[PDB]
Amino acid sequence: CGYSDRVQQITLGNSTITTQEAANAVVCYAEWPEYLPDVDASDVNKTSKPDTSVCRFYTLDSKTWTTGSKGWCWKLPDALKDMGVFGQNMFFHSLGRSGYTVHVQCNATKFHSGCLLVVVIPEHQLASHEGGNVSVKYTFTHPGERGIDLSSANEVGGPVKDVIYNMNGTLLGNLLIFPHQFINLRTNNTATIVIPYINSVPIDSMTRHNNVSLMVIPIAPLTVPTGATPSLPITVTIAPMCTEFSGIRSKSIVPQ
Amino acid sequence: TVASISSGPKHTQKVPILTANETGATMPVLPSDSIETRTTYMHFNGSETDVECFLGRAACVHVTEIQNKDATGIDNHREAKLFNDWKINLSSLVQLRKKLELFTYVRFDSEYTILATASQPDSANYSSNLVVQAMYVPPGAPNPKEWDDYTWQSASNPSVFFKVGDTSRFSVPYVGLASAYNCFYDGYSHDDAETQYGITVLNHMGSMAFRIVNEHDEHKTLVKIRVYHRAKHVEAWIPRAPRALPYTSIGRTNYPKNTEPVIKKRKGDIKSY
Amino acid sequence: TVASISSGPKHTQKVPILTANETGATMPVLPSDSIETRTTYMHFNGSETDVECFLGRAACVHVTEIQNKDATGIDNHREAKLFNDWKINLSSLVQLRKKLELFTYVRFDSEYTILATASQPDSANYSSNLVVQAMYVPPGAPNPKEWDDYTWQSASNPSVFFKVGDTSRFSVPYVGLASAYNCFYDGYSHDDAETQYGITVLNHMGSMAFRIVNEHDEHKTLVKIRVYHRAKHVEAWIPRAPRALPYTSIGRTNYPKNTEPVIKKRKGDIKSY
Amino acid sequence: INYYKDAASTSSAGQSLSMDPSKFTEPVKDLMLKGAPALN
Amino acid sequence: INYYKDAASTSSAGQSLSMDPSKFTEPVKDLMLKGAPALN
Amino acid sequence: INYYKDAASTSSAGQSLSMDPSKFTEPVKDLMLKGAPALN
Amino acid sequence: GLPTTTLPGSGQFLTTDDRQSPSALPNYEPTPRIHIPGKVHNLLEIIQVDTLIPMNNTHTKDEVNSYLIPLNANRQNEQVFGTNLFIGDGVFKTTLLGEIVQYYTHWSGSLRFSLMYTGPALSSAKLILAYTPPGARGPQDRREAMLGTHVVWDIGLQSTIVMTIPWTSGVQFRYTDPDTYTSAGFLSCWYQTSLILPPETTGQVYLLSFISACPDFKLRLMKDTQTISQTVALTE
Amino acid sequence: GLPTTTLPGSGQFLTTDDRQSPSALPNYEPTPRIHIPGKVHNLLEIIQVDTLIPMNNTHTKDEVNSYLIPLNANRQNEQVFGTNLFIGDGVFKTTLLGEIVQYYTHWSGSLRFSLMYTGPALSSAKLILAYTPPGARGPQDRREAMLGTHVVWDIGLQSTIVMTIPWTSGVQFRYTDPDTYTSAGFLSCWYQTSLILPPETTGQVYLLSFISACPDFKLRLMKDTQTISQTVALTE
Amino acid sequence: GLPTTTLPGSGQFLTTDDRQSPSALPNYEPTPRIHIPGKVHNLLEIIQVDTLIPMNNTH
């Protein structure tokens, strides 16, 4: 009985991702993403299913993991609003529903040390740094493909950037309850998380609401060998999956 | 049902205690996998840990004081405490809020129990027989403006009348627009640069107005009305990381600046017991 | 069922009245074994002597006074009698303690009945309509610190509200960690030269906090709260020698120094009647 | 008729009708019958 | 016995007796059995 | 279970389940089917 | 709603009624029951066990000596001990039988009275245990006591005598508290022959006295005992 | 009308009773139920999931560093970390298991304690995880800890060890609140061999510690937690 | 008489509860029901009928 498990590949549309140091992919709540059934539907407009034209992997700009980096946060579907036909359909339709296959990549040598916690939080409602009853402005919660850097300073009307309190008042060690995977450089170069549609409604506005928030947080800090650059590149790859759009209308207007 | 199985010596090439937590799976390793054990039974079902039991006991959600006095020489009857309004939400008390906010979506039938208690801080010769009116104002209905407003007639709005000192209790079906309540919402009311985040009509159950329907007397009686909520037929989805820091507002996830450390620092090094 | 059998003259080499009590056995010798008897029936079942009947009637376990007055100018609300705490134990009343302490282990369901009674030793014009709150504080839960503390919200702790003058009654399942309560414990909390003997968390049922939830008035009303306990589904093991001397503390077997004789000395010699 | 969900809510079970004082009156290894010599 | 017309008037349903922690403890694509290498 | 002698003592009858809006929406002599010309 | 009428005595607190009530801990699972030796179902089981009677209650302070009935050598036709039979008072008040009896008002059935000899193995004595039913004077001589219910006990290999006091009453139940119309009678013990001691042995020898109930014993109408009392509530 | 008598405790407010009551919205139809992933029926499902333990709780302020247990190279026969086992206090109070445990008074069953290694792929270390049952001193040496329940962990291809703490107790349930008679024991970790680092690599490497319940875990008698509190009512 | 315990909220006036109650006119026979055209069982019948919208509300 001779075989290996570290080698797996995912092909979506015309894009293919290959791996040689992978940990078993995670499927949130053991439920694979699926189309909205007639027994749960509310809006009567027949849904547009674009299949291979939108269901493919999009690479987000790489981030640089330094020894002093606090972590990174992305909001979905906001992070894909400028990505090809998915980005246009998401603004041309009033309502949308979609699952996602998230694939995070961080490769390093056999001498490097460090561990990332890659976790998906549904309704990751952020706290403002000002406390009291202050709200987070739309422009800071919807950054797009450049995401939120938790290493940066706080901003007026912006969310809080203390990673340990998860930007919402919970501790970092408890994030393991949400679908997560670790990129331990000693064991793995890639985390993978398949997310179904998570909402209290069957289909919803894609411009006003983010269903999930992806967080990549270094737990054990980056430890490079003596004489190597104290920095490592992180690339995030996301593919919409089992996507549904409804209520076509003139292009949606958002701030900035 | 067996809790621990009978298990003897182990000499094998299959090692259940070694794994890769990097996979995001917490392996179901048992006591019998690390050492040799005897057969014992669970002899317990776990009924007190059901989500229906953890959320299904009463807790106070609002406390308010109302007064029986003449309305002559007053411009605002709510500021005179002649009647009081409550924006219905379960996020005012931290003991209940943390239990309920441990899940992302919850769908339950409510059961309200209202306790009104009288007090005479000023001179009174007898214990007045006051009757309190609790009126439910769903979103869109006219909220009372005066203690003797036409709105209190309640031709269609649900209303309950009870004697002060006693209690009233009424059940309420699931009133949310969606299939479950949203405990958290990573979104806005509309696509706008200055609109409200999280707090939105998704968490708007309506309002409750409270008055003393009895006419005003010669003595002032302060009545503290206490609303208790108990959930029935509870369902919960997407378990969440528990709240650690104190709260600052209803329906928002904010915490105070300069907050105290939540990790209880140990006395001595990492090796002390 | 026959109580005494019909029995005539006896002329035998088997002598049922002679034995050896040194063996620790009390021989079942009957009236018919010492003299000649007639047949008679028991015509009695013994239902009033069952352990469920001997321990299954109410008895008071605690009495406490609480006051409705302003909390201004007070540093301790418990010392001002605004609220009171009871370390739950059934060893404060000697009439109940001696019955229950006649066995080594007892397992029973409890039934508490609380009676609150009002009194105005100072000037008052009417009988105030006070509502008392009885809150169960299991070990680990925050005991109330003030009469208006956040703890009284009771988001998870069992709590009961009732009008003074009336009564409340609630059942409690067997709450012991072991299979039966320990009435006596020949041991310690830990292997230590200065630790507590007998009194230990084996006999720690928790605490009950009592307050008047009504606001404070112009007149002082002293409310005496009386807790009564009645056992249900009682089981008892290892019968014990009965208590003879008066007690000195809860959960401990001590007696006073210079105690009076318990044997009622006879008037005259050992031959008098 | 029981009006509540829990067994702790119930009334008493009455009496345990099968009694046997022998385990307290004669807890001896060898069984002793009355009339026969206790010791021999 | 129910004394009212609505389902919202009813008492609790008790407990959902069929539990399965696997959807939260092991939400992995390939099934992993304990003792076999997690990775190979 | 009814606790009184009169029908006026009873609780509501619930809902009249068989509805038909046609007597108010289309009270016309000749029946008109949608898609066919209303007039010809 | 059902029209109902509340009978008199509604909302009153009766300490003996056994009705159902709501649990303060709903859905709670209690610790499993384990096998513990010595389970008691009814008090008629334990009251049937012998306990020592402080028959020599003629001392200034409580001592172990109070349980030892003195026997003296070379005494002919003389009394060993004597007592009235109020089982809720006197020498019986401190015994297990008398102490359990004090938790009840009415008693009926036969008592088991036992004596164990402790003198030397070469020693001998013959004693007469005599029970005098009520109505008759407490006996002044063995001839007077021997006219009643009696057991002549030859002290030998069997060290203990067991004389059962038969239930002699017109009325079906007697009071546990001393009342003359419900008096149980008297017990006396006398020298049938005499106590003979072996050579080179001196002083008085002793008898131990025991009390237990017969399986036909009955007790009813529960009450609080007056063998213990308190003036102030206890603290921990 | 039916004659009835009201028992004591009528009209009292008990926060735990589950009886029917009238609807304030009669004939109301609720929004249909939809399939939402991640349904929770009981807390024994989610308490069985691993959460990081802030074992390095030796910092002045809360930091990510508090979850990293330090390992140092070239250390022989020395302790890595040590802790008492009160799961409702100390390092466990902030974890999901400890935080859920604090909503209950009594706990029973076995705990799952796990460690994940994060040093270089060419690095090696052998560690001994040792659990000391209650009654015995907190161990001062590996020889003292190795006398108890232990797992020797060879750090290699499998990055994580899972040592299950067997339920060692006389009493069936322990208190969640720190009480000495119901103490759970101690955990310690020691160098079995030593930590060896590859050439051209420096400093300390780290272990991540996790806690979860076994399927035989039990919790009972609900209570409010003291991990959160308020002085004034919240507003919107 | 049956021992009973009154739950909290006894004797309170809730404007929506539908329980039976005693008649003030016992043994009364009501006028017979007659056929009247236009019977309405539910409002979803009449809300389905067209009504003019004051769209030019600019006066």
mmCIF file with all atom_site columns, N, CA, C and O in Angstrom, chain G residues 34-66:
data_model
loop_
_atom_site.group_PDB
_atom_site.id
_atom_site.type_symbol
_atom_site.label_atom_id
_atom_site.label_alt_id
_atom_site.label_comp_id
_atom_site.label_asym_id
_atom_site.label_entity_id
_atom_site.label_seq_id
_atom_site.pdbx_PDB_ins_code
_atom_site.Cartn_x
_atom_site.Cartn_y
_atom_site.Cartn_z
_atom_site.occupancy
_atom_site.B_iso_or_equiv
_atom_site.pdbx_formal_charge
_atom_site.auth_seq_id
_atom_site.auth_comp_id
_atom_site.auth_asym_id
_atom_site.auth_atom_id
_atom_site.pdbx_PDB_model_num
ATOM 1   N N  . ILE G 1 34 ? -24.563 4.025  44.374 1.00 0.00 ? 34 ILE G N  1
ATOM 2   C CA . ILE G 1 34 ? -23.515 3.006  44.537 1.00 0.00 ? 34 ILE G CA 1
ATOM 3   C C  . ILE G 1 34 ? -23.914 2.023  45.629 1.00 0.00 ? 34 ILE G C  1
ATOM 4   O O  . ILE G 1 34 ? -24.732 2.332  46.491 1.00 0.00 ? 34 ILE G O  1
ATOM 5   N N  . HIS G 1 35 ? -23.351 0.822  45.620 1.00 0.00 ? 35 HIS G N  1
ATOM 6   C CA . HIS G 1 35 ? -23.674 -0.142 46.664 1.00 0.00 ? 35 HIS G CA 1
ATOM 7   C C  . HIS G 1 35 ? -22.888 0.209  47.928 1.00 0.00 ? 35 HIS G C  1
ATOM 8   O O  . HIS G 1 35 ? -21.660 0.159  47.921 1.00 0.00 ? 35 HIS G O  1
ATOM 9   N N  . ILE G 1 36 ? -23.591 0.585  48.990 1.00 0.00 ? 36 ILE G N  1
ATOM 10  C CA . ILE G 1 36 ? -23.020 0.893  50.302 1.00 0.00 ? 36 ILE G CA 1
ATOM 11  C C  . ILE G 1 36 ? -23.632 -0.125 51.264 1.00 0.00 ? 36 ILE G C  1
ATOM 12  O O  . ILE G 1 36 ? -24.857 -0.253 51.295 1.00 0.00 ? 36 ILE G O  1
ATOM 13  N N  . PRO G 1 37 ? -22.847 -0.885 52.037 1.00 0.00 ? 37 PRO G N  1
ATOM 14  C CA . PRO G 1 37 ? -23.404 -1.854 52.972 1.00 0.00 ? 37 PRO G CA 1
ATOM 15  C C  . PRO G 1 37 ? -24.178 -1.134 54.083 1.00 0.00 ? 37 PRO G C  1
ATOM 16  O O  . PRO G 1 37 ? -23.977 0.050  54.338 1.00 0.00 ? 37 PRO G O  1
ATOM 17  N N  . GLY G 1 38 ? -25.106 -1.827 54.734 1.00 0.00 ? 38 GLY G N  1
ATOM 18  C CA . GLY G 1 38 ? -25.862 -1.279 55.866 1.00 0.00 ? 38 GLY G CA 1
ATOM 19  C C  . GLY G 1 38 ? -27.016 -0.337 55.534 1.00 0.00 ? 38 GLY G C  1
ATOM 20  O O  . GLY G 1 38 ? -27.216 0.642  56.236 1.00 0.00 ? 38 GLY G O  1
ATOM 21  N N  . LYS G 1 39 ? -27.812 -0.620 54.505 1.00 0.00 ? 39 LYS G N  1
ATOM 22  C CA . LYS G 1 39 ? -28.987 0.179  54.110 1.00 0.00 ? 39 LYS G CA 1
ATOM 23  C C  . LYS G 1 39 ? -30.146 -0.014 55.096 1.00 0.00 ? 39 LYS G C  1
ATOM 24  O O  . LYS G 1 39 ? -30.486 -1.153 55.381 1.00 0.00 ? 39 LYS G O  1
ATOM 25  N N  . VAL G 1 40 ? -30.764 1.060  55.596 1.00 0.00 ? 40 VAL G N  1
ATOM 26  C CA . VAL G 1 40 ? -31.908 0.993  56.534 1.00 0.00 ? 40 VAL G CA 1
ATOM 27  C C  . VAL G 1 40 ? -33.184 1.440  55.836 1.00 0.00 ? 40 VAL G C  1
ATOM 28  O O  . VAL G 1 40 ? -33.255 2.569  55.368 1.00 0.00 ? 40 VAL G O  1
ATOM 29  N N  . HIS G 1 41 ? -34.210 0.589  55.752 1.00 0.00 ? 41 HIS G N  1
ATOM 30  C CA . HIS G 1 41 ? -35.485 0.963  55.131 1.00 0.00 ? 41 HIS G CA 1
ATOM 31  C C  . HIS G 1 41 ? -36.456 1.516  56.171 1.00 0.00 ? 41 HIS G C  1
ATOM 32  O O  . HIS G 1 41 ? -37.179 2.463  55.903 1.00 0.00 ? 41 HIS G O  1
ATOM 33  N N  . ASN G 1 42 ? -36.499 0.919  57.358 1.00 0.00 ? 42 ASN G N  1
ATOM 34  C CA . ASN G 1 42 ? -37.395 1.266  58.449 1.00 0.00 ? 42 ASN G CA 1
ATOM 35  C C  . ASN G 1 42 ? -36.731 1.188  59.832 1.00 0.00 ? 42 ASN G C  1
ATOM 36  O O  . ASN G 1 42 ? -35.907 0.317  60.073 1.00 0.00 ? 42 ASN G O  1
ATOM 37  N N  . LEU G 1 43 ? -37.108 2.035  60.784 1.00 0.00 ? 43 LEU G N  1
ATOM 38  C CA . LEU G 1 43 ? -36.551 1.990  62.145 1.00 0.00 ? 43 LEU G CA 1
ATOM 39  C C  . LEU G 1 43 ? -36.863 0.710  62.917 1.00 0.00 ? 43 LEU G C  1
ATOM 40  O O  . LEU G 1 43 ? -36.107 0.374  63.826 1.00 0.00 ? 43 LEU G O  1
ATOM 41  N N  . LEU G 1 44 ? -37.897 -0.051 62.543 1.00 0.00 ? 44 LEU G N  1
ATOM 42  C CA . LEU G 1 44 ? -38.184 -1.331 63.200 1.00 0.00 ? 44 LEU G CA 1
ATOM 43  C C  . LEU G 1 44 ? -37.086 -2.373 62.953 1.00 0.00 ? 44 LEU G C  1
ATOM 44  O O  . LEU G 1 44 ? -37.055 -3.406 63.608 1.00 0.00 ? 44 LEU G O  1
ATOM 45  N N  . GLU G 1 45 ? -36.160 -2.104 62.040 1.00 0.00 ? 45 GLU G N  1
ATOM 46  C CA . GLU G 1 45 ? -35.007 -2.953 61.804 1.00 0.00 ? 45 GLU G CA 1
ATOM 47  C C  . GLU G 1 45 ? -33.936 -2.717 62.872 1.00 0.00 ? 45 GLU G C  1
ATOM 48  O O  . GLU G 1 45 ? -33.442 -3.652 63.486 1.00 0.00 ? 45 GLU G O  1
ATOM 49  N N  . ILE G 1 46 ? -33.559 -1.451 63.098 1.00 0.00 ? 46 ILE G N  1
ATOM 50  C CA . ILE G 1 46 ? -32.487 -1.104 64.036 1.00 0.00 ? 46 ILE G CA 1
ATOM 51  C C  . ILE G 1 46 ? -32.925 -1.117 65.496 1.00 0.00 ? 46 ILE G C  1
ATOM 52  O O  . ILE G 1 46 ? -32.125 -1.436 66.364 1.00 0.00 ? 46 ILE G O  1
ATOM 53  N N  . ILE G 1 47 ? -34.205 -0.892 65.801 1.00 0.00 ? 47 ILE G N  1
ATOM 54  C CA . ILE G 1 47 ? -34.679 -0.932 67.198 1.00 0.00 ? 47 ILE G CA 1
ATOM 55  C C  . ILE G 1 47 ? -34.696 -2.372 67.737 1.00 0.00 ? 47 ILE G C  1
ATOM 56  O O  . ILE G 1 47 ? -34.809 -2.627 68.931 1.00 0.00 ? 47 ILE G O  1
ATOM 57  N N  . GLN G 1 48 ? -34.544 -3.346 66.844 1.00 0.00 ? 48 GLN G N  1
ATOM 58  C CA . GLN G 1 48 ? -34.532 -4.765 67.149 1.00 0.00 ? 48 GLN G CA 1
ATOM 59  C C  . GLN G 1 48 ? -33.134 -5.244 67.571 1.00 0.00 ? 48 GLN G C  1
ATOM 60  O O  . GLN G 1 48 ? -32.974 -6.410 67.897 1.00 0.00 ? 48 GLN G O  1
ATOM 61  N N  . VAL G 1 49 ? -32.122 -4.367 67.582 1.00 0.00 ? 49 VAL G N  1
ATOM 62  C CA . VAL G 1 49 ? -30.736 -4.638 68.000 1.00 0.00 ? 49 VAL G CA 1
ATOM 63  C C  . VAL G 1 49 ? -30.537 -4.273 69.479 1.00 0.00 ? 49 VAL G C  1
ATOM 64  O O  . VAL G 1 49 ? -30.975 -3.219 69.930 1.00 0.00 ? 49 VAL G O  1
ATOM 65  N N  . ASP G 1 50 ? -29.874 -5.126 70.253 1.00 0.00 ? 50 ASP G N  1
ATOM 66  C CA . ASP G 1 50 ? -29.597 -4.925 71.681 1.00 0.00 ? 50 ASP G CA 1
ATOM 67  C C  . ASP G 1 50 ? -28.639 -3.749 71.944 1.00 0.00 ? 50 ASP G C  1
ATOM 68  O O  . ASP G 1 50 ? -27.629 -3.602 71.271 1.00 0.00 ? 50 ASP G O  1
ATOM 69  N N  . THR G 1 51 ? -28.919 -2.929 72.955 1.00 0.00 ? 51 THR G N  1
ATOM 70  C CA . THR G 1 51 ? -28.031 -1.850 73.439 1.00 0.00 ? 51 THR G CA 1
ATOM 71  C C  . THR G 1 51 ? -27.951 -1.950 74.947 1.00 0.00 ? 51 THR G C  1
ATOM 72  O O  . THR G 1 51 ? -28.904 -2.412 75.565 1.00 0.00 ? 51 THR G O  1
ATOM 73  N N  . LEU G 1 52 ? -26.826 -1.583 75.555 1.00 0.00 ? 52 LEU G N  1
ATOM 74  C CA . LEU G 1 52 ? -26.666 -1.695 77.000 1.00 0.00 ? 52 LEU G CA 1
ATOM 75  C C  . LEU G 1 52 ? -27.544 -0.689 77.748 1.00 0.00 ? 52 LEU G C  1
ATOM 76  O O  . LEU G 1 52 ? -27.630 0.475  77.380 1.00 0.00 ? 52 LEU G O  1
ATOM 77  N N  . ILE G 1 53 ? -28.185 -1.139 78.814 1.00 0.00 ? 53 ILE G N  1
ATOM 78  C CA . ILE G 1 53 ? -29.036 -0.351 79.705 1.00 0.00 ? 53 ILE G CA 1
ATOM 79  C C  . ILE G 1 53 ? -28.188 0.119  80.890 1.00 0.00 ? 53 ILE G C  1
ATOM 80  O O  . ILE G 1 53 ? -27.578 -0.732 81.534 1.00 0.00 ? 53 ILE G O  1
ATOM 81  N N  . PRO G 1 54 ? -28.115 1.414  81.231 1.00 0.00 ? 54 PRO G N  1
ATOM 82  C CA . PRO G 1 54 ? -27.383 1.897  82.391 1.00 0.00 ? 54 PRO G CA 1
ATOM 83  C C  . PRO G 1 54 ? -28.214 1.597  83.639 1.00 0.00 ? 54 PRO G C  1
ATOM 84  O O  . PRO G 1 54 ? -28.771 2.484  84.271 1.00 0.00 ? 54 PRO G O  1
ATOM 85  N N  . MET G 1 55 ? -28.325 0.321  83.998 1.00 0.00 ? 55 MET G N  1
ATOM 86  C CA . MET G 1 55 ? -29.128 -0.129 85.130 1.00 0.00 ? 55 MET G CA 1
ATOM 87  C C  . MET G 1 55 ? -28.553 0.387  86.445 1.00 0.00 ? 55 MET G C  1
ATOM 88  O O  . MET G 1 55 ? -29.300 0.811  87.314 1.00 0.00 ? 55 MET G O  1
ATOM 89  N N  . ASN G 1 56 ? -27.231 0.402  86.618 1.00 0.00 ? 56 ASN G N  1
ATOM 90  C CA . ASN G 1 56 ? -26.618 0.988  87.801 1.00 0.00 ? 56 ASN G CA 1
ATOM 91  C C  . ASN G 1 56 ? -26.550 2.520  87.667 1.00 0.00 ? 56 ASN G C  1
ATOM 92  O O  . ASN G 1 56 ? -25.484 3.117  87.768 1.00 0.00 ? 56 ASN G O  1
ATOM 93  N N  . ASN G 1 57 ? -27.669 3.205  87.445 1.00 0.00 ? 57 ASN G N  1
ATOM 94  C CA . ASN G 1 57 ? -27.702 4.665  87.363 1.00 0.00 ? 57 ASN G CA 1
ATOM 95  C C  . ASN G 1 57 ? -27.788 5.270  88.767 1.00 0.00 ? 57 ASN G C  1
ATOM 96  O O  . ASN G 1 57 ? -28.640 6.102  89.039 1.00 0.00 ? 57 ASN G O  1
ATOM 97  N N  . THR G 1 58 ? -26.848 4.941  89.646 1.00 0.00 ? 58 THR G N  1
ATOM 98  C CA . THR G 1 58 ? -26.844 5.388  91.052 1.00 0.00 ? 58 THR G CA 1
ATOM 99  C C  . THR G 1 58 ? -25.549 6.102  91.418 1.00 0.00 ? 58 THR G C  1
ATOM 100 O O  . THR G 1 58 ? -25.196 6.219  92.587 1.00 0.00 ? 58 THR G O  1
ATOM 101 N N  . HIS G 1 59 ? -24.840 6.588  90.399 1.00 0.00 ? 59 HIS G N  1
ATOM 102 C CA . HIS G 1 59 ? -23.578 7.319  90.511 1.00 0.00 ? 59 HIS G CA 1
ATOM 103 C C  . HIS G 1 59 ? -23.801 8.838  90.419 1.00 0.00 ? 59 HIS G C  1
ATOM 104 O O  . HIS G 1 59 ? -24.799 9.279  89.853 1.00 0.00 ? 59 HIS G O  1
ATOM 105 N N  . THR G 1 60 ? -22.906 9.664  90.961 1.00 0.00 ? 60 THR G N  1
ATOM 106 C CA . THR G 1 60 ? -23.043 11.135 90.895 1.00 0.00 ? 60 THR G CA 1
ATOM 107 C C  . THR G 1 60 ? -22.870 11.688 89.472 1.00 0.00 ? 60 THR G C  1
ATOM 108 O O  . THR G 1 60 ? -23.625 12.568 89.060 1.00 0.00 ? 60 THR G O  1
ATOM 109 N N  . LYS G 1 61 ? -21.901 11.164 88.707 1.00 0.00 ? 61 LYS G N  1
ATOM 110 C CA . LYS G 1 61 ? -21.582 11.560 87.319 1.00 0.00 ? 61 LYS G CA 1
ATOM 111 C C  . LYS G 1 61 ? -21.685 10.340 86.391 1.00 0.00 ? 61 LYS G C  1
ATOM 112 O O  . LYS G 1 61 ? -21.602 9.206  86.855 1.00 0.00 ? 61 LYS G O  1
ATOM 113 N N  . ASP G 1 62 ? -21.843 10.533 85.084 1.00 0.00 ? 62 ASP G N  1
ATOM 114 C CA . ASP G 1 62 ? -21.908 9.414  84.133 1.00 0.00 ? 62 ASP G CA 1
ATOM 115 C C  . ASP G 1 62 ? -20.551 8.682  84.106 1.00 0.00 ? 62 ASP G C  1
ATOM 116 O O  . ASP G 1 62 ? -19.517 9.316  83.906 1.00 0.00 ? 62 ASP G O  1
ATOM 117 N N  . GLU G 1 63 ? -20.534 7.366  84.305 1.00 0.00 ? 63 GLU G N  1
ATOM 118 C CA . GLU G 1 63 ? -19.333 6.520  84.252 1.00 0.00 ? 63 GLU G CA 1
ATOM 119 C C  . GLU G 1 63 ? -19.616 5.185  83.562 1.00 0.00 ? 63 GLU G C  1
ATOM 120 O O  . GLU G 1 63 ? -20.762 4.759  83.497 1.00 0.00 ? 63 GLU G O  1
ATOM 121 N N  . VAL G 1 64 ? -18.588 4.460  83.106 1.00 0.00 ? 64 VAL G N  1
ATOM 122 C CA . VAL G 1 64 ? -18.785 3.123  82.497 1.00 0.00 ? 64 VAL G CA 1
ATOM 123 C C  . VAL G 1 64 ? -19.396 2.182  83.540 1.00 0.00 ? 64 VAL G C  1
ATOM 124 O O  . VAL G 1 64 ? -20.220 1.332  83.223 1.00 0.00 ? 64 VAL G O  1
ATOM 125 N N  . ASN G 1 65 ? -19.094 2.434  84.813 1.00 0.00 ? 65 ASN G N  1
ATOM 126 C CA . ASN G 1 65 ? -19.592 1.698  85.959 1.00 0.00 ? 65 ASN G CA 1
ATOM 127 C C  . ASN G 1 65 ? -21.128 1.708  86.019 1.00 0.00 ? 65 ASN G C  1
ATOM 128 O O  . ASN G 1 65 ? -21.734 0.771  86.516 1.00 0.00 ? 65 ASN G O  1
ATOM 129 N N  . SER G 1 66 ? -21.788 2.705  85.426 1.00 0.00 ? 66 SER G N  1
ATOM 130 C CA . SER G 1 66 ? -23.244 2.773  85.442 1.00 0.00 ? 66 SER G CA 1
ATOM 131 C C  . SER G 1 66 ? -23.901 1.634  84.638 1.00 0.00 ? 66 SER G C  1
ATOM 132 O O  . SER G 1 66 ? -25.057 1.297  84.882 1.00 0.00 ? 66 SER G O  1
#
